Design an enzyme around this catalytic site. Structure first.
Site, PDB file in Angstrom:
ATOM      1  N   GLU A   9       5.788   4.994 -10.080  1.00  0.00           N
ATOM      2  CA  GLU A   9       5.314   5.979  -9.108  1.00  0.00           C
ATOM      3  C   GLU A   9       6.289   7.119  -8.841  1.00  0.00           C
ATOM      4  O   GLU A   9       5.841   8.187  -8.421  1.00  0.00           O
ATOM      5  CB  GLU A   9       4.984   5.314  -7.774  1.00  0.00           C
ATOM      6  CG  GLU A   9       4.093   4.098  -7.887  1.00  0.00           C
ATOM      7  CD  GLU A   9       4.880   2.799  -7.814  1.00  0.00           C
ATOM      8  OE1 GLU A   9       5.732   2.578  -8.702  1.00  0.00           O
ATOM      9  OE2 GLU A   9       4.651   1.999  -6.870  1.00  0.00           O
ATOM     10  N   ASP A  82       4.715  -0.659  -7.474  1.00  0.00           N
ATOM     11  CA  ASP A  82       5.161  -1.567  -6.411  1.00  0.00           C
ATOM     12  C   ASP A  82       4.231  -2.756  -6.173  1.00  0.00           C
ATOM     13  O   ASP A  82       3.018  -2.651  -6.387  1.00  0.00           O
ATOM     14  CB  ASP A  82       5.305  -0.792  -5.104  1.00  0.00           C
ATOM     15  CG  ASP A  82       6.468   0.159  -5.125  1.00  0.00           C
ATOM     16  OD1 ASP A  82       7.377  -0.002  -5.977  1.00  0.00           O
ATOM     17  OD2 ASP A  82       6.473   1.062  -4.269  1.00  0.00           O
ATOM     18  N   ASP A  84       2.204  -4.484  -4.037  1.00  0.00           N
ATOM     19  CA  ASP A  84       1.357  -4.603  -2.852  1.00  0.00           C
ATOM     20  C   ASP A  84      -0.038  -4.081  -3.179  1.00  0.00           C
ATOM     21  O   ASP A  84      -0.327  -3.676  -4.311  1.00  0.00           O
ATOM     22  CB  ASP A  84       1.964  -3.865  -1.648  1.00  0.00           C
ATOM     23  CG  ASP A  84       2.151  -2.365  -1.888  1.00  0.00           C
ATOM     24  OD1 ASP A  84       1.541  -1.803  -2.827  1.00  0.00           O
ATOM     25  OD2 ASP A  84       2.923  -1.737  -1.130  1.00  0.00           O
ATOM     26  N   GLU A  86      -1.419  -1.281  -2.360  1.00  0.00           N
ATOM     27  CA  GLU A  86      -1.429   0.120  -2.762  1.00  0.00           C
ATOM     28  C   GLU A  86      -0.973   0.263  -4.209  1.00  0.00           C
ATOM     29  O   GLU A  86      -1.588   0.991  -4.996  1.00  0.00           O
ATOM     30  CB  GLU A  86      -0.534   0.916  -1.810  1.00  0.00           C
ATOM     31  CG  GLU A  86      -0.929   2.365  -1.631  1.00  0.00           C
ATOM     32  CD  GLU A  86       0.298   3.269  -1.525  1.00  0.00           C
ATOM     33  OE1 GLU A  86       1.386   2.742  -1.185  1.00  0.00           O
ATOM     34  OE2 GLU A  86       0.180   4.495  -1.790  1.00  0.00           O
ATOM     35  N   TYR A 298      11.931  -5.246  -2.044  1.00  0.00           N
ATOM     36  CA  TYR A 298      10.901  -4.290  -1.656  1.00  0.00           C
ATOM     37  C   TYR A 298      10.694  -4.294  -0.149  1.00  0.00           C
ATOM     38  O   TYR A 298      10.635  -5.355   0.476  1.00  0.00           O
ATOM     39  CB  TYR A 298       9.598  -4.633  -2.362  1.00  0.00           C
ATOM     40  CG  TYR A 298       8.471  -3.664  -2.103  1.00  0.00           C
ATOM     41  CD1 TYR A 298       8.640  -2.292  -2.285  1.00  0.00           C
ATOM     42  CD2 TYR A 298       7.225  -4.124  -1.693  1.00  0.00           C
ATOM     43  CE1 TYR A 298       7.588  -1.407  -2.059  1.00  0.00           C
ATOM     44  CE2 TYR A 298       6.180  -3.254  -1.456  1.00  0.00           C
ATOM     45  CZ  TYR A 298       6.358  -1.906  -1.646  1.00  0.00           C
ATOM     46  OH  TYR A 298       5.294  -1.070  -1.402  1.00  0.00           O
ATOM     47  N   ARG A 300       8.219  -3.328   1.940  1.00  0.00           N
ATOM     48  CA  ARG A 300       6.943  -3.577   2.603  1.00  0.00           C
ATOM     49  C   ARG A 300       6.607  -5.041   2.372  1.00  0.00           C
ATOM     50  O   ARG A 300       6.099  -5.417   1.307  1.00  0.00           O
ATOM     51  CB  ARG A 300       5.849  -2.643   2.096  1.00  0.00           C
ATOM     52  CG  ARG A 300       6.200  -1.186   2.351  1.00  0.00           C
ATOM     53  CD  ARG A 300       5.028  -0.221   2.213  1.00  0.00           C
ATOM     54  NE  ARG A 300       5.476   1.102   2.655  1.00  0.00           N
ATOM     55  CZ  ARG A 300       6.133   1.969   1.887  1.00  0.00           C
ATOM     56  NH1 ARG A 300       6.390   1.681   0.612  1.00  0.00           N
ATOM     57  NH2 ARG A 300       6.525   3.132   2.385  1.00  0.00           N
ATOM     58  N   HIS A 330       6.202 -13.569  -2.519  1.00  0.00           N
ATOM     59  CA  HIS A 330       6.942 -12.428  -1.995  1.00  0.00           C
ATOM     60  C   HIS A 330       8.221 -12.894  -1.307  1.00  0.00           C
ATOM     61  O   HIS A 330       8.472 -14.088  -1.149  1.00  0.00           O
ATOM     62  CB  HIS A 330       6.091 -11.615  -1.024  1.00  0.00           C
ATOM     63  CG  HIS A 330       5.116 -10.704  -1.695  1.00  0.00           C
ATOM     64  ND1 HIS A 330       5.508  -9.711  -2.566  1.00  0.00           N
ATOM     65  CD2 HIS A 330       3.765 -10.635  -1.624  1.00  0.00           C
ATOM     66  CE1 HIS A 330       4.440  -9.068  -3.004  1.00  0.00           C
ATOM     67  NE2 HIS A 330       3.370  -9.611  -2.451  1.00  0.00           N
TER      68      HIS A 330
HETATM   69 MG   LIG Z   1       5.542   2.674   5.363  1.00  0.00          MG
END
Ligand SMILES: [Mg+2]
Ligand SMILES: [Mg+2]
Ligand SMILES: [Mg+2]
Ligand SMILES: [Mg+2]
Ligand SMILES: [Mg+2]
Ligand SMILES: [Mg+2]
Length: 538
Positions: A9, A82, A84, A86, A298, A300, A330
């Protein structure tokens, strides 16, 4: 000679990953999202179960074309977004643009950007998880329907240019409810009495507790007098001595919520900055000739788990640096290499990255340490029914507090101490505290409403929308925020509702696991919401 293509990204990420992988790999950044909903229309297909209508993002056309050319040249394509929801939808949009087979195993996930984590990821790539993708889609469809439905109503009844969102509206109502409590609060005067005593010529302090074996509230200067007049001479009986050892365990390792809370409380970081700086730490920083390396896992995450290998390496750091007495899919937010002490890499970090990394290093190491232990003593000093309580504390084992109290003169029941002086002091009660960024985050986590992706953006948009201000580090509603909150309460009561919104997030959680069909979550929301939009347009 045809290379492997790896799409990431951000450039900082691609630079970092590029050294890790070597010749037969080419690493490129897509530079954010490349497909999105249309901006000029609702972009939801209501005849086809809320299916989103996506377009290529305005401006990203040339970037998209070059990705397609690189993919043609490539031996195989690896989507390294990443780990997650998203990141999975990014990978799905790239699959779509590149005409990749969704049954292919082209998705590689890792939660720190280190040579070892990166290479293990290519050992067992997986196909794109459409449940994760559908969970991202659902949130996007929900937020679109709400935002583009309410905003025109705000334009009609308040002001052009306004907008609202689901979690943003929950937060605003929480802030306004707290302000209503503050307005309704009635302060009261009350008084305390500090006592200063002696056992031998060792001085110490004890605070008035009460009269005649109850706690006594002193509401005025006259109530202080009545205590004072009960005090004849200076002699005080040691009516009781209580001793205990108090174990203060170590905090858990950071999640997104607790990192955001600690950064705001301890180093005055706004939540947006915390996430911005964490991203820099995560995606890779130049450690000199050793090139760019990812320094933290990471950022998040709602997991507190540490991996076995990470656990062992910290125990060794602790055993070696403090004593073995300080130890024991995770992950939490931790240093990727504990041996990268804050001190060692300080020269490679700017001041802000140094603070956040120091915070994350200290917390993760502490979390791998043993409990602190304290030596308590509570001492009751009574004369003529007047009770003063002395408290004393000292540490018997620093424990986790290694990375970062007065004691009482000795006493036993029946001894006597002498009263030197008493200091009455006037106070006033205070209303409940306003929400800080910390406590707002903590509230949103505990009541089920927030998620790692939504904490920081919620506190950002509520301020970008001018619905709150942030002074003395706490949120206050603005007049415009009160107006908007009242409209939405009037016409869309469920979108300020804590329980309905935590419910929705749990349904999103079920979509992610494949327990619920994303289109069904939208339909159960939309069917009632649609009626409310019609009535608000009356
Ligand atoms: Mg944020
Ligand atoms: Mg295009
Ligand atoms: Mg999402
Ligand atoms: Mg949302
Ligand atoms: Mg949206
Ligand atoms: Mg308030």
């Amino acid at each position: 000679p045809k290379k492997n293509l790896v799409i990431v990204e951000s450039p900082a990420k691609a630079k970092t990953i590029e050294k890790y992988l070597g010749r037969s790999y080419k690493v490129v950044a897509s530079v954010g999202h490349i497909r999105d909903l249309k901006k000029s229309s609702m972009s939801i297909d209501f005849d086809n179960n809320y299916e989103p209508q996506y377009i290529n993002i305005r401006g990203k056309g040339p970037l998209i074309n070059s990705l397609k050319k690189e993919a043609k040249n490539a031996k195989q394509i690896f989507l390294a977004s990443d780990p997650d929801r998203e990141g999975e939808a990014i990978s799905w949009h790239l699959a779509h643009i590149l005409d990749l087979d969704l049954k292919g195993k082209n998705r590689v996930v890792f939660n720190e950007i280190t040579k070892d984590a990166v290479k293990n990821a290519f050992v067992e790539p997986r196909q794109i998880d459409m449940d994760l993708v559908d969970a991202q889609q659902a949130r996007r469809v929900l937020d679109r329907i709400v935002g583009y439905s309410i905003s025109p109503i705000l334009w009609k009844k308040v002001k052009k240019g306004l907008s609202a969102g689901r979690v943003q509206s929950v937060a605003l109502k929480l802030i306004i409810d707290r302000e209503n409590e503050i307005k309704a609060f009635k302060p009261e005067e009350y008084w305390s009495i500090d006592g200063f005593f002696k056992k031998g010529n060792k001085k110490f302090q004890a605070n008035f507790y009460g009269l005649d074996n109850k706690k006594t509230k002193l509401k005025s200067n006259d109530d202080v007098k009545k205590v004072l007049t009960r005090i004849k001479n200076d002699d005080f009986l040691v009516d009781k001595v209580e001793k205990k050892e108090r174990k203060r365990n170590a905090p858990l390792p950071y999640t997104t919520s607790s990192l955001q809370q600690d950064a705001a409380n301890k180093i005055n970081f706004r939540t947006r900055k915390t996430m911005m700086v964490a991203q820099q730490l995560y995606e890779g920083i130049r450690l000199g000739s050793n090139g760019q390396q990812g320094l933290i896992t990471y950022m998040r995450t709602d997991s507190t788990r540490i991996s076995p290998v990470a656990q062992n390496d910290a125990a060794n750091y602790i055993t070696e640096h403090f004593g073995a007495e300080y130890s024991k899919a995770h992950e939490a937010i931790r240093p990727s290499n504990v041996n990268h002490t804050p001190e060692s890499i300080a020269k490679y970090l700017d001041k802000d990255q140094l603070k956040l990394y120091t915070l994350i290093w200290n917390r993760f190491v502490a979390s791998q340490m043993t409990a602190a232990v304290f030596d308590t003593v509570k001492v009751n000093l009574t004369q003529n029914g007047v009770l003063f309580i002395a408290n004393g504390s000292q540490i018997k084992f620093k424990g986790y507090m290694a990375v970062y109290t007065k004691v009482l003169p000795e006493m036993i029941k029946g001894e006597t101490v002498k009263k030197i002086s008493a200091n009455p002091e006037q106070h006033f009660t205070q209303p409940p505290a306003r929400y800080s960024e910390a406590s707002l985050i903590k509230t949103l986590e505990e009541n089920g409403v927030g998620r790692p992706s939504t904490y920081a953006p919620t506190l950002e948009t509520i301020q970008k929308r001018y619905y709150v201000r942030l002074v003395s580090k706490r949120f206050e509603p603005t007049e415009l925020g009160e107006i908007v909150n009242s409209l939405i309460i009037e016409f869309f009561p469920d979108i300020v509702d804590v329980k309905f919104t935590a419910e929705m997030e749990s349904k999103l959680d079920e979509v992610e696991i494949g327990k619920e069909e994303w289109q069904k979550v939208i339909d159960q929301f939309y069917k009632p919401f649609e009626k409310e939009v019609i009535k608000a347009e009356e």
